[model samples]
Target: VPISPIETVPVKLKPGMDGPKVKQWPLTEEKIKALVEICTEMEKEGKISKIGPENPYNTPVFAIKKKDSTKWRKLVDFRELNKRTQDFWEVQLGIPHPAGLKKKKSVTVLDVGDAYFSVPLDEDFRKYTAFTIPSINNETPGIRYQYNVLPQGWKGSPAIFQSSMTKILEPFKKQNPDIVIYQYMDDLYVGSDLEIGQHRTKIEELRQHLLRWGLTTPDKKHQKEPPFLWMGYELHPDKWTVQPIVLPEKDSWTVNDICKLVGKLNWASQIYPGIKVRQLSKLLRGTKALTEVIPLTEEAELELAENREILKEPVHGVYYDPSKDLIAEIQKQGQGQWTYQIYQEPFKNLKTGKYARMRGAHTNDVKQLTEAVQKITTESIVIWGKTPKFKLPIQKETWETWWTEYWQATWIPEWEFVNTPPLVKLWYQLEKEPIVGAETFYVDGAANRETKLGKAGYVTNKGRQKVVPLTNTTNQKTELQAIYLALQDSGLEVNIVTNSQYALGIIQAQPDKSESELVNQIIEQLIKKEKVYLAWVPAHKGIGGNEQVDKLVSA
Candidate 1:
């Protein structure tokens, strides 16, 4: 809690990272007032210190409106400094679809108040965080200062902040892999595939972890249930809804401004399919400097206006469960023919690890073909990024024919469904005082490095060994399967023991099923049991059942 532990939050620079001191950029009267006010508060919080300004690094600072709030956010233009610093982060910064878009029943979005400022800076690096303010008197220069904490707009701020936050919650992450915690700078989305009761429990657990690290979540912004907003989209376990675009306003437009707006809209295009990403891009085609204001083309302005309307209407997506399919239909009007691309399911050959391609033309009977396609294809497409890797290049000619043909030729199923299981409580774990049952099972899972497939095994009190085969994903996953195998329809009120805390945490916390029918099958049987206890015993110990299960798994 004390400044995020010095070791975890120090902001340093590249060995030779240096830049010429930059004078403050011009600001409006309001900006100057906001800057001084924000600075005084920051000083009180020990985020920045007034210095003699004897550092080679100085950058421009300004204030802007926050996306979802009326409050002002102060940002330093450390673009020059960012270019000079070296990236020491191996994890870097990014929140992908998989992190926040998984099908959990509820998603709790929370914001870490003063995220970057909570992370401290080293003396050597504070000098590099220098900035200046507008002087009251135009005749002389203004006061100069450097940050005592990580400052916004510095590239390293996010790198270090993410690293620090990740490290703080790492123990929890290892313990609860089923809990989906997606963080982007200060905003976070913590998801639970379990029921509402456990959802709140997991969120509270995350809250305490952050509190211990000096990070505070603003209670007002703590969205406790779905349809909540995270990273600008309204999120639910089964789907994510679009929110209105909060565009930065100004009298005139600059290439940079348009580019920034476009970037925001492009990120939102997942739900707002009508966004004219291509037409709006034409506005950025000129060879003009980013900041210079340009005359707006009539067509471009119309396109921009259209996008604004698109923002007003909220369209959403229903997350495709493993069992669902997307019917992509395109009709060539003049030909009076209909074409549909049925995104069926996985491939027979799992090696390619790529998406399935496109195919077809049909009319009223398209639904029939869709069903057939869904039945035959073995797998679903894995979305690698926000957009497709390749685009169909129609040569003002005819390329889409072969393009789709190339697609049908390309793309690539699941118990391979049994692999890549969803997260949440696979079954209940006794959270309160747990009572040991009359019968017990010790579980363990393992895999050969060369085999890339893992196996789980359990040992009964009677010294009988049972092994369960799995995708050899992670040893933890295999261990969970071992525990799952022990819960088969053979009725018994029991104690389930395992060496892997990972498996225990997962089972104790999750249960939306189909991510793994294996997990579902186990949960179903577990519900029927009158007594079930979970215990974690140390591995490599010479305990009877533990040793036997360990031996069974080693095979």
Candidate 2:
């Protein structure tokens, strides 16, 4: 096998960058020596399970066992030559409140810090800090001052610093088990909510731990009270938070800044009902006082008129504008401005050419304005279509009703009719709806091709939690099938939550309805007795047990 001079490394991204970058870890004799030392230690401990080219473009990932765990620890080395390497030394500033405080959270403050590099081929040697290139005349530009100390394209710096920092804290973790430490690159946060005595003991243990590893605690100027600052954020026993940082003030926001903030907002106009891009554009112009002098042109007026016509009756003659007389009448009736979307107006396109325009809200209550509009249409010379009277009626039955009813009907039958052998016997089944002539089926082939199922019987509590994967199938049915199997095989008191409300109805109904005969048959075969209860849960609502089932069902 051949080896490259550089080693692979991994790093995380700073929020400011468009994305992360990867590049080579600058190699020096010091860095090489340190790498050899770490590699030797890892080899002796049998921790190095993988070796490969240290390409800068690729980030390698590895895991480490818990400090107390006996398993070999894993680490990733990201020093390699790659274009995607990210700048890690850039510190992001933020602010945070203490625990149990009710104060409103503030906008994050970003204070970037200096970047650092590892000592080449020497673990003990001092690492290099960022510095700017000197001009021949010895006169540096303002921008050059900031650029001097930062390395431009170092890939492995982040991972290297992160790993070295982790090693520095390992002794603290060993000494103070109660304190939990979390780090990202050079940022370190230690948390512990133990009582004061225990907390102090833990802190002292960490101090000793750092001392033992020959690593210095934060300098006095950088230190604060417990739950102190770490990497531009406040670290607490329970949480980490950003600390406040002063931001450079601008006399006025630049056009670019305005575009950056408002551009995306305008793109999101669809989410805001009835919002117009022109209106937003006008407002933006107004902010800069440009709208005052930007007189409307004849073309612009014509465009507006055309758009008004299109909007007034978007769907043929379903929507029509009322005349001035009707508008006066509406005002007399104490009605406010009509600002609803064109779709909400009452109108109908009964035929391609025939339009029935009605007055009122397009959504509903549109009929109320129809009579007034009709009167105005007759008086005004504007082209008018016949008035439409057709409307959709409010129905007692809704999709939710069907969903609930079907679920109950299916579930009750299996609950009441399925016979159990006096002992717990769980059965599993999967169900999926099909498309394009595809039929839904369960895993046991009890249903159509749209289901996946699992079953376990007489399973202990642990086994109940470890329900096997459902057979591969289409959407909703996949979850249904896995749940059915888990209940069947585990035989423990089963609580089943499935995505398909229809399947739930099939299981719980007292007698299977004609439409649900297949569902009834599957339930009867799997459920020996009325031991299991079926539940229907809404997907992606953050419901706990359902979320677990959803994740596993998809998996």
Candidate 3:
């Protein structure tokens, strides 16, 4: 693509200060050769200019693995340069977050390919974007180069690039008032609520304008029709719903994995843009200020597995519909700030209007605030004719509840049901082994961190210990299995001391029906013994018997 008429002002540094040339890590010849190939291609495109080693400013260069494992993305570490560069973003017009495009049905998002590279920097400012590659194959001394365009990683790149794009689109916008356009930095969407054919026509019309101005969209980045995958969500004009986000299979996830996946889910939420995330709260909070390899706890593992299960399936989240009457709903807690959701039926259209701005943490003495916000919000509601629901949060709740089961087959509600059985509460389901001794045993469970294999253990007050290996299990299952094994053949007037209130519930739980054979077995064993007393103790306590069983299984 040719350098655009749309270009950046000179790189703005702090007054009387410029970044010094930065040092780079030494590299092997093979790696160095690969980098030279990359630099050659970049220079060939005129994205960067091969220059003498005279530029005083330099940013460090680095290579990162591409999405296709073996390939690489060349990057510049211009953080120090960026810190020194003056930012004018505060004074410039703001580009809305790309997330605004998430719910628009007929929208076509155009990602300006090589965004920074295509927007050349003014001549004199190029030196500040400089980097160096040491001598390759001893063919020459170190080579210095500088970007001919707005380079990536600079603080003002987005601000500068977006302003230029806005200017470029201004004339187009004035002429084609029928066509609606959205811009966020280099990503532009040429869209319309009209016929798909009209949408197609306008896109071509703009494509030529872009060509005249020397801006280009990469072939892969631009889509020709609906079923468009923009910003990673597959938007369909036909189904009018985005399919569930497909997550890559992973045995374990790093902080980046969680962060990136959460990013997708965040956009997905925009389809509803309501509230209530139980496990999602964990998924969200877990990655706070974390990067790379953060700790993954068992609780996190359970939450991630559930989240992955959700993403692995299809979910048609309620999307924004301007035609539908908008709703401004609020839920007030006893004290503290009030939270509200603004949507149009089954979903909230939050990102688009000023009414969305009416949302904030408001105090309970919301007399003037509610009337004022509702007046304006209702004015839009009337103009837009939104069916405002007073309880959008609850409506949001209903959607999440339905989708949870929609994805995972079982709706684990906000508050889980606690099952306490009658016989065990007042009882046993098993009748096999006869009662023998006044034996008191501690039943506990353990698991393999590597393999996730589980085992159940039983320890007697006399130091006698027994453990049974189990397969296809969770920690809860393992806990139940421990009670079952201890009562199975070693039956008696065996009083069980188990830390699992969950297992105790299973044994005491109405033996109406159960999915777990381990749970059924424990309950059956309880009945077979004719009478068994169960005790609950805090886990990992000073109790030697439970400790013995814990050791028995881990061994």
Candidate 4:
């Protein structure tokens, strides 16, 4: 059946902005001939109209490779033209969730060919969708043509088609109250929870309705099955089980690769609700740069494995219970360092009946944390906390080992703060006060010659002090280490006070080759959605925070 065009509205261009004329990307002679042929046929069929050189609106055209085929699909670079076009109000199509189709005995899906072209553009606005193509066989060279039907890449094409489709299918929806029908753009799914015979009847009814509107479904895209793939999810009739289509291997990917994968997984989560999606969300946080090379970290690998496992054992509904499950927050400490704290819901000291928590020592590894979490069912453990700067993939064997060791541990201490006293509020004039939640950090480093050892420590606004042991340290290295420690502990808004002029100078100005890498790391943290203030505090001063940090470094 020949699809009829339905004209509704014209596109509105932005004021004072002229349409762009971009040259086509270089292509083979054969490829150019193929593209020209397609456009010429469309023009002859009145699907598009030829325009003269006087038309100011123009866009470039290109061909994209079709999946699993040698054929190339012609496409237009409508981005420039789209910017000038007015935004169309989106249409609301009644699309059913893959999970909602669980109880249906059978399912059938139909797809429309050239979906967007079925909607016609208003004649007055056709010229605005103009593009120039090279001549084919002794014909006019560089001829301009515009779409009379809605173009594939136009801004308003989807919404316009959706509106038209809704009107065409409205009567079918009214006549069949028992059958469930859903449409998502070009694809339509018709089924019912009752029986296979009922679903077949609904499919036939839908076919007749499409015929009435001059729409025909291609044989290859149409399907009838109990477990059908829809919108990147495998939907099953029983219990409405929706599993994510297996993600391809992304061994060494750029930031954009990870972003695209994350987007797909996030969309899948909407259809299949579970804890696996939460794990993937943590992996996505490390993707900051679009072009930067992102290594597949141990944490990411673990999350991916967990996602695969979850997909295999599909869930019926909400499965995670926070009250009985153990949750761990894996927080990043600094360069290649992380610390995790474990909490059992309604945590109470077995000895004292008071709320309590247990935190692990900072390590430059996730093996210990991953192992501990894996002993229990993946669904039983909840993972949270700050994402690391670098990738951290999970190893199944190591994760399981850690989990076993953690369970057999004889003593787990109560999470407590020592040497660092509690904070006391200090009032200041409103005009002189700093932003709420801003912190002041005092840092210092010390080396004892007798012991041949070095250490770094920092004290924050809450009087919490953290001491870190240094390796093969010099005065400069120790001082720099102190600054790094302070920056790590402080929040987004921080005031860092240090006694080392060399360290302060390095942070504020160009760093020498010796400390350039460390300086860069500190700068990255400083610029990330935070305000950092650096000040030189005189050595051996009686500053309370400085004195406490000095005491910590010596001990």
Evaluated with TM-score, which candidate comes out highest? Answer: 3
Candidate 1 lDDT over 131-191, as tens digits, reads: 8888555666776777887777777776677777777778888988988777666777787
Q: Considering summed lDDT, which 10 consecutive residues are worst modelled in model 3? A: 417-426
Judging by lDDT, tell me the better candidate of 3 and 4: 3
| TM-score between model 3 and native | 0.54
* Ranked by lDDT, top first: 1, 3, 4, 2
**Candidate 3 error regions (>4 Å):** 1-4, 69-71, 90-109, 137-140, 193-199, 238-313, 328-343, 346-389, 392-555
For 1-555, candidate 3 gives per-residue lDDT tens digits of 354466457655788777657776666776676778888898887787777757666667767666857756677788788777776754344433332333443577677666676677767677677788876545566778887777666667777777777788899999888676766666676667767767777787788888776788766788767776544456565233444555545566566676666566555543333322334335545355555555566665564566555555444433445455445544332122233444455442443221122232221122322333454454444333343444322233433433343223332122211222110011233322433565778889977666778888888866667778877667777887787777774555776788887766554433423455555455556656655767788887758588777777763
TM-score of every model versus the real structure: 0.52, 0.27, 0.54, 0.52
- Give residue 528's error in model 4 in angstroms: 34
Candidate 2: stretches off by over 4 Å: 1-81, 84-153, 211-214, 221-255, 259-555
Model 2's alpha-carbon lDDT is 0.34
lDDT of 2 by residue, 293-347 (tens): 3333454344334433443432221213243111111211112111111112322
Ranking by TM-score: 3, 4, 1, 2
- Of candidates 2 and 1, the better by lDDT: 1
lDDT of 4 by residue, 253-347 (tens): 77677667666665444323232333334555746678887767677777677656655664432112333433333332322223332333322
Task: Give the TM-score (vs. native) of candidate 1.
Answer: 0.52
Tell me the whole-model lDDT of each prediction, alpha carbons only: 0.61, 0.34, 0.59, 0.58
Candidate 2's TM-score: 0.27
Worst 10 residues of 1 by lDDT: 412-421
Could you tell which candidate, 2 or 4, scores higher by lDDT?
4
